């Protein structure tokens, strides 16, 4: 790895600098380097890794959607033939996106998940695994699409099972997992009723546990609860 000669602490320091500079590709490369040092990641470090790749892949997804929309319009009736370029360029962005997802999934598999024993780390990583398979599913159109979808579902489900056993219903990781698994159901698995049920139950169980929280924990939890409500409003 190109980061093999840099100290772990220096990689972390630079990831934080990259974040301040909105240099998310750099941030992701620094955090990949840090992961490849082989030590477990702290809570803060795990969130640097997730922020970095979320921003990188988020940009790719947004571009893919623009290009996919243009390509779809080109295959409508009465659309003039413009040649292979739209498809080629959509494929280029798609391949880059798939590469980033495979990189993240590779980090999780080698060896973040297997060393993650505490619920907060294990659920965090399994949520990421579900998320990055979900992004692969968004662009999948071939013979492996069902298997990609099932890989997302399996990771989310393992995360859900651990989170329900080991975390309070207001835990932000548990809430964010549920938010995203609900979106998986709606947007990927063609299961809007499951999506709505999950979001509602998650919201209601969190509401009932808010009384146990400090002011700062309350603020954190209610932010994600509002996202659940926002999705429910979109879907009903």
């Amino acid at each position: 790895g190109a980061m093999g000669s840099m100290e772990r602490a220096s990689l972390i320091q630079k990831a934080k600098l990259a974040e301040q500079a909105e240099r998310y590709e750099d941030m992701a490369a620094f955090m990949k380097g840090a992961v490849e040092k082989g030590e477990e990641l702290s809570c803060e470090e795990r969130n640097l890794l997730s922020v970095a790749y979320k921003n990188v892949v988020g940009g790719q997804r947004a571009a893919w959607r623009v290009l996919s929309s243009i390509e779809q319009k080109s295959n409508e009736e009465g659309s003039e033939e413009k040649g292979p370029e739209v498809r080629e360029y959509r494929e280029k962005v798609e391949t880059e996106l798939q590469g980033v997802c495979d990189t993240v999934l590779g980090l999780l598999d080698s060896h973040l998940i297997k060393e993650a024993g505490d619920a907060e780390s294990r659920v965090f990583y399994l949520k990421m695994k579900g998320d990055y398979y979900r992004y692969l599913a968004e662009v999948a159109t071939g013979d492996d699409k069902k298997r990609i979808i099932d890989s997302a579902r399996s990771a989310y489900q393992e995360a859900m099972d651990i989170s329900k056993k080991e975390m309070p219903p207001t835990n932000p990781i548990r809430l964010g997992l549920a938010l995203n698994f609900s979106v998986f159901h709606y947007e990927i698995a063609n299961s809007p009723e499951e999506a709505i049920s999950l979001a509602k139950t998650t919201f209601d169980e969190a509401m009932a546990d808010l009384h146990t929280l400090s002011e700062d924990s309350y603020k954190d939890s209610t932010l994600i609860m509002q996202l659940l409500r926002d999705n429910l409003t979109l879907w009903t």
């Binding site: 998320d131 964010g176 938010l179 995203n180 979106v183 999705n231 979109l234 879907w235």
Partner: peptide, 5 residues
């Protein structure tokens, strides 16, 4: 598009 985190 729906909210994810």
């Amino acid at each position: 598009f729906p909210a994810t985190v």
